[PDB]
Structure formats: C-alpha cells, structure tokens
Amino acid sequence: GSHSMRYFFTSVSRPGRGEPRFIAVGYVDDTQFVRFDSDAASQRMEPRAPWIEQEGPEYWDGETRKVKAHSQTHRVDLGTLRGCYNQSEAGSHTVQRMYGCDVGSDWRFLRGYHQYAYDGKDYIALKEDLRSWTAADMCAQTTKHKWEAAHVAEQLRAYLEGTCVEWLRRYLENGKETLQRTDAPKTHMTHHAVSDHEATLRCWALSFYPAEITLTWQRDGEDQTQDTELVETRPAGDGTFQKWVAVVVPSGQEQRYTCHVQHEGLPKPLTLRWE
Amino acid sequence: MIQRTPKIQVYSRHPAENGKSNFLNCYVSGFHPSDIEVDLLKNGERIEKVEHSDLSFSKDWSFYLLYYTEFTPTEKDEYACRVNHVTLSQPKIVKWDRDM
Ligand code: MET
Ligand code: MET
Ligand SMILES: [Cl-]
C-alpha cells in the first residue's frame, strides 16, 4: 500500500480577542500522530499516536521550535493578506497550509505537495514538478513573484523528496503494527420500510482500514450513483473506518438492487444481494 | 466570504446492545470557517465529558472534527448531536438512530 505524511496548519485571526489561533496536526496516512494548539497550556508539540511517544527530547524540542516559528509566519501572513485584499481589520480570516509527501508500497518518493488557502479558497500551490507555482488571484501572483525571486520552491522540493521521506519511513516502521495493516470491511445491507410503497436500502462497510473504499449500488446491473446517498467515510474512534450508501426504492424491487464493495482488504470486489 | 455547511453524522463505534458500554460519535465534516459548536446530548442535556479530535481539513480545505464520549445505549435514553455554525440559522439536532 502507498503511504503519505502530511502536516496541516490552520491559522485564524480573531481581531480584539487575542493573537491568531494556530493549530497544527501531523498525519501518517489516515492516522494522526502529533498536534500543536496555540491556545493550549503546554505550548509544546504533543504526541497523538502511541508510536511517536518513543521519540527523544531533541525531537519534541525541535518540532516545538519549528511549529512555533510556523505560527509566527502565519500570524504575519494574515496581515499581508488582509492588506492585499483590502479587507477590514475587524473581520476573522483563515490561512491554511498543507504539505507532505507520498511514497509507494516500496517506500520510495511518489509525489510532494505544498499549498495554501485563504478564507477557504486555493491561494498558491506548488505544482507536481516541485519547481513552479499555481497562483490564480492577483494577490497570490504577487506572492509567487516574491517566492520565485527567493528560490522558495527549491528549498521545499529538497524537504519533500528527502527529509519528508526519511521521517515517513521511520514512523511507518515504529508504527508498523498499526500503519502496515489491512482490516477488510465487515459488510451487510439493511432494509427499512419508509412507508407502504418505498424502502430504504443501506449498504454498510464497518471496521475497515485503510479509509479508501468504494461502495456503489446497481439496479439490474446499472450504476445508481445519481440516486445514491453516500455518506463521508467516518472514523469509528478505534483506528478503523465506517461508510454507508443508501437508495430509496419501490417496495418489492429489492432483488433488482446490488451493493458493490471495493477495498484493498478484499481479495475480490464483493457483491451483496437481496435473494 | 466562503462558507460551507457541516455534514453531521451521529453513530456508535460498535453495534449497540442495551446495557453494554460503547462510544457515541458525532463526526462533523465539510465546514468552513472553523468556528463550530458541537454537543452530544443525552435526553436533551449536554454531555460534559465529551472529547474531540484536533482540527484538521480535507483536500478541498473544508474542516472536520470527531466528537466522542463513552455511553451505554438503553431502551429509553435518547442520544443526539447538536451543531451550530455560521451557515445554520439555529442549532441543528441530529438524533442517533441505532436501526440504520
Ligand atoms: C510540526 S512543524 C514541523 C513539521 C515537519 N516535521 C517539518 O520538518 O517541516
Ligand atoms: C498563503 S500565506 C503566504 C503569504 C506570503 N508569506 C506573502 O508574504 O506573500
Ligand atoms: Cl483558508
């Protein structure tokens, strides 16, 4: 299975109610492993997966120093962006940043990412080549000019292809019992009569890992995605995931409807029937 | 400003059995901006012990949080999640339905 390491930063201005809120989280695949919260008492990068606890003091001090430094750059960014967009000083705004790396089954570099949003909209992103930027609006083109002149992309590319991959390997090993597992979904369908003439069919996938899955309905072999209610894949709390997909059907047509499940834990795609 | 409405899911960790300790989850996803209020309710009252995940976001930049607590499903106790967000005119209450 392919794997990823990602950091997610969220910075929110709150004019007159404090300095901006800053929250940082780190993930390996779908498993969170560290956090920082500027409003918390500790003012430390903190562990959130058992397998990171073993890291030594150089690690916690280093990550703490880095995350605080990132909080400060984002604090100043909120001012730069408010100014560029000619926004009022009163309003709350959001900066987001995501970066990290993907490796394949073989733990070799696949892809890197480094990208930003302002108020929920793409702002600037490093392209897949890790050499060039995507910047739609004029404010982001100004940033792009500055980042080109400062050779920012080159520094980011070096992290993403090197250090990022090294950390990802270490964590995957330290965490291998968790991270290098597959839990196949436990599947079933439920039927509930909404009335005398229609029934809700719900196709369930429970207790699966990793999170990627596909659930689809067919009616006499015809894909029903347009008529299907598909919920967002959701955490059970225990490091496994759950998902369901539902269709509302005329009572008596249940046998026409089949649910199709795809997951890496499954030797073969599964079809569930009413029969 | 961009605003995106929370998608609320309220559910148990394990298949529920009356009298058997379990975990009640309220997963809220796809929202923007990040300020949100989320409560788990037992018989309409806020559960005070509730924990939540650290704020994170999806590839589309929308935020997600899991709120969770230990709970014991029973025949007559009603569980729910109550969510408020700038996109909602008033708090949205979603009841736990164990028969889904
Ligand atoms: C948690 S801030 C530091 C994140 C990451 N380990 C880095 O070196 O960029
Ligand atoms: C999207 S936050 C980055 C803004 C950047 N530091 C600038 O000064 O243009
Ligand atoms: Cl944003």
Residue numbers in the entry:
A (entry chain A): 1 to 275
B (entry chain B): 1 to 100
The study reports:
Major histocompatibility complex (MHC) class I molecules bind peptides in the lumen of the endoplasmic reticulum and present tightly binding (high-affinity) peptides on the cell surface for recognition by cytotoxic T cells. To better understand the peptide-binding process to MHC class I, we have recently stabilized class I molecules by the introduction of a disulfide bond between the alpha helices in the vicinity of the F pocket. Until now, the study of the dynamic processes that accompany peptide binding has been hindered by the lack of a crystal structure of the peptide-free form of class I. In this paper, we present such a structure for the disulfide-stabilized form of HLA-A*02:01, and we describe the concerted conformational changes of the amino-acid side chains lining the class I peptide-binding groove that occur when a peptide binds. We find that both the A and F pockets contain side chain triads that undergo such concerted changes.
As glycerol molecules tend to bind into the MHC class I peptide-binding groove and to stabilize the MHC fold in partially empty crystal structures, we switched to crystals of dsA2/GM that formed in the presence of 1,2-ethanediol (EDO) at 10 mm free dipeptide and determined a crystal structure of dsA2 at 1.6 Å. In this structure (dsA2/GM2), two GM dipeptides are present in the peptide-binding groove, one in the A pocket and one in the F pocket. The latter GM occupies positions P8 and P9 of a full-length nonamer peptide, and the carboxy (C) terminus of the GM superimposes well with the C terminus of previously determined structures with full-length peptides that have a C-terminal leucine. The GM dipeptide in the F pocket has higher atomic displacement parameters (average for all atoms, 33 Å2) than the GM in the A pocket (25 Å2) and than the surrounding residues of dsA2 (25 Å2). This indicates that the GM in the F pocket is more mobile and possibly prone to leaving the peptide-binding groove. We conclude from this structure that dsA2 can accommodate two dipeptides at the same time, one in the A and one in the F pocket, and that they are bound like the N and C termini of a nonamer peptide. We next asked whether binding of the methionine side chain of the GM dipeptide in the F pocket of the dsA2/GM2 structure triggers conformational rearrangements of the F pocket side chains compared with the smaller C-terminal valine side chain of the NV9 peptide. This is indeed the case: to accommodate the methionine, the side chain of Tyr116 flips towards the center of the peptide-binding groove to form a hydrogen bond between the phenolic hydroxyl group and Arg97, which is also pushed in the direction of the A pocket.
